[PDB]
């Protein structure tokens, strides 16, 4: 339905592309989110990020993936209409700064995120920008993967894809070291970083550049060699000058976490893309044995 | 090999949904299979001039075939549809797609930048923004994993044959991409090594030599008659050492099946 039936309420923020607004349907009363894309400014027609997001979001149909209601298609601008949830996770972590997010809610969220990602991967979709900002929570304890602008439909087996991929902090070692191929594992890496972030209340690897990002990973998980990552020393962006650091204790890296939690996390952050746990296999992990669905608290 | 199984299942489910109307060309008042063959052949050239992935080309044809399943198009506008579909295919699949200006340039000034952009909108509207279609190429690369062992000649020939299927709506429009890929893979495998459709691919796909036969009969014919065909861009393309010069190989006299 036309833009005439929508009243814009507030500008929420900038996506990987476009601009997100809270809006209200004037006829039904329904609150939606709108993603506005201007086809002016860059006379290249509909951008690829929009093309990829729309087509992939229309296929994907899962309780832990944001629901796309409609696509409104002017010759001036392009609007995507989404279900309105409450808040992105980044904003939720800001609102819960003083108290932190309770461990049962962290468990619940990671579980739902793994379910969404598994569904994504089983449908040949890489997200490639998993981070707190791109995840949406509602008022009843659900979380959903959003912003598929940097997503890609992949082939079996994969070709070389875009190398820019993933916000630095959440970027996997295989991308950083400039491997020919990368795959589903890079999404897993990002979730691991998010998981730790929710627990420690700060980002796990807050690097400033590519090289600083690598060194922060190396310091925490130990510098990779042939035994841990077969063929790491031959990779394009590996250097002989790298500091040979030792892996530090994981109960020191993530203190509030139980033995089950440390086990999962260390598997989500395994150096070898092949040995890194899948989203499917991570759902089986004992860590999620007693998972509940708590509501989020946001006002204290 | 953890998602490989359920991805194959999903793609096998999707190829039925992104399937074009079987006899859409009969309902088209002004265009024929011949014109389509010229169009696709020209798209092959574009892909060569701009070094585009095979996947992009296979997607463009799907987009065109689905567009023509619901919209009547006059002959003088068929090249515009192909251009917009190649542009959409590039934005979807390519790391560095060519810019719109480059797509205008290859039409020899027959269409304006404005026209190509408006057509892009129309294709999207008609295809209802569903562009992640299964292709022959996608099923082929999956089948290549079952080579015992990996053979570069067979890979290139299977791609060449799968590609030839795009040119001729009659008959190949009636076969699913997974069937064509199967027939192509077997035909390439028999031609180079003498080996046949592997045991592991019977378990994976549920396709036997008998179930593949119809498509495999047509594809053998297209292969044998390839130097005759009015369209030659694919044959010229696969002359190159990038594809091991597989188009120059002699096809077998019979399949013996
Ligand atoms: O929230 C969304 N975020 C997107 N990418 C980055 C951003 C996060 C926050 C602002 S921009 S796309 C997107 C769509 C969307 C859908 C539903 C929503 N419900 C509530 C609040 C924001 C929403 C945003
Ligand atoms: Mg006709």
Coordinates of N, CA and C and ligand atoms in Angstrom, one line a residue, chain B residues 25-26 28-32, ligand 2:
Chain B
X25 N 6.2 -19.2 -24.8 CA 6.6 -18.7 -26.1 C 5.5 -18.8 -27.1
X26 N 4.6 -19.8 -27.0 CA 3.4 -20.0 -27.8 C 2.4 -18.8 -27.6
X28 N 3.3 -15.8 -26.7 CA 3.9 -14.6 -27.1 C 3.6 -14.3 -28.6
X29 N 2.9 -13.1 -28.8 CA 2.5 -12.8 -30.2 C 3.6 -12.4 -31.1
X30 N 4.6 -11.7 -30.6 CA 5.6 -11.1 -31.5 C 7.0 -11.7 -31.4
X31 N 7.3 -12.6 -30.5 CA 8.7 -13.2 -30.4 C 8.7 -14.7 -30.4
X32 N 9.8 -15.3 -30.9 CA 10.0 -16.7 -31.1 C 11.2 -17.2 -30.4
Ligands
LIG2 MG1 5.5 -16.8 -30.5

